[PDB]
Write a protein that binds this DNA or RNA. Structure first.
Ligand SMILES: [Zn+2]
Length: 355
DNA sequence: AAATTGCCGAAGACGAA
DNA sequence: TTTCGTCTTCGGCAATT
């Protein structure tokens, strides 16, 4: 049953080729335009992220995430309240290329993202060989979203990010609990990689809204997805397949089908599901606990874990323990009850919504 | 020095044991 | 049933020109 669902969700090579061809054409040209002189984003580099590049994209290759990361040395972070995820960015710098984005010492995400969008929008109108347009700025989004007609609709989220090469913020110190799973050497190496800040970009009118940045660990998540086994040979050609990624695919699919016809399930997203399975992979680190022969039981325990997260209203950010994804803030209690009331129904009735 | 080069892992497609 | 093996393309990474 679940095996058949996965086959339906599996991407087609023909679709992948046609989509990637067009996307790569657009992204590289935009990345190049960003590199020409007199540009404040002259040093930006590309880092592909999200479901497609983690090979957990389902149904169709019609959504692509791309990070345009800017190296920002000499950075000074200030934690926004007791959040742990949200920060203000201060500089310790004379002729700075982003000096016109500064409000005193404070780096404005709104001003920087504005000019970033302006540059992309100008280059997009110069594209004549591809049907591509820039979607209107959406509240809460750190990305300039492209709409491509290939003729099939394709969305490309170009995410502006600040790259810092120093130690990760102290709010992440007790995060990434992969010690008994991927090990201490892997964790230490991962945390020697840079961390990333993206614009939080809310329009609620709250204080600091134009200058609040949020942590992004999309790169770390991507590595983890590609290196997810306790054994080094997991899912390799001389190793054994596990069902970790397919459980994620199935859980992603269950949520999306539910979100389609229920507006109450808004404010829920794939990242909640992704976060949950990361905790699950931590609690069940053995590759033998994720055998393909036990796909049904593996998916069921993921559901049980998720349901318990709803019931207790607690889903800690995998990298930032303080940040509860299921707080009373962000998500109302009525919403968790509703999703819980739709999950067990699907769970008990052999998943009719998969059809 | 901007971007081509060299390599092969991950996984989609097909197919015989 | 499948699934294992082989062939295939896409992507990631840095050495190179
Ligand atoms: Zn695996």
């Amino acid at each position: 049953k679940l095996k058949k669902v996965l086959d339906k969700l599996r991407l087609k090579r023909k679709d992948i080729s046609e989509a990637a061809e067009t996307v790569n054409k657009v992204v590289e040209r935009l990345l190049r335009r960003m590199q020409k002189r007199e540009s404040e984003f002259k040093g930006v580099e590309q880092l592909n992220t999200g479901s497609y590049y983690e090979h957990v994209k389902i149904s169709a290759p019609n959504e692509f995430d791309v990070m345009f990361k800017l190296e920002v040395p000499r950075i000074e972070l200030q934690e926004y309240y007791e959040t742990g995820a949200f920060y203000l960015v201060k500089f310790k710098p004379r002729g700075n290329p982003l000096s016109h984005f500064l409000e005193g010492e404070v780096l404005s995400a709104t001003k920087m993202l504005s000019k970033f969008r302006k540059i992309i929008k100008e280059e997009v109108k110069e594209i004549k060989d591809i049907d591509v347009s820039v979607e209107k700025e959406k509240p809460g989004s750190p990305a300039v979203t492209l709409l491509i007609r290939n003729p099939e609709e394709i969305s490309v989220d170009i995410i502006l990010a600040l790259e810092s090469k120093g130690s990760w913020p102290i709010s992440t110190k007790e995060g990434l609990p992969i010690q008994g799973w991927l090990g201490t050497k892997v964790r230490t190496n991962l945390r020697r990689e840079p961390f990333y800040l993206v614009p939080k970009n809310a329009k609620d009118g709250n204080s600091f809204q134009g200058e609040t940045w949020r942590l992004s660990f999309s790169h770390t998540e991507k590595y983890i997805l590609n290196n997810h086994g306790i054994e080094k040979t997991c899912c390799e050609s001389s190793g054994a397949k596990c069902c970790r990624k397919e459980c994620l695919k199935l859980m992603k699919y269950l949520l999306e089908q539910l979100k389609k016809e229920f507006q109450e399930l808004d404010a829920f997203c794939s990242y909640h599901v992704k976060t949950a399975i990361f905790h699950m992979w931590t609690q069940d680190p053995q590759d033998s606990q994720w055998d393909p022969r036990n796909l049904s039981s593996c998916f069921d325990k993921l559901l049980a874990f998720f349901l318990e997260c709803l019931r207790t209203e607690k889903l800690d950010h995998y990298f930032i323990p303080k940040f509860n994804l299921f707080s009373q803030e962000l998500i109302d209690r009525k919403s968790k009850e509703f999703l819980s009331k739709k999950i067990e129904y699907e769970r008990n009735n052999g998943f009719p919504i998969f059809d």
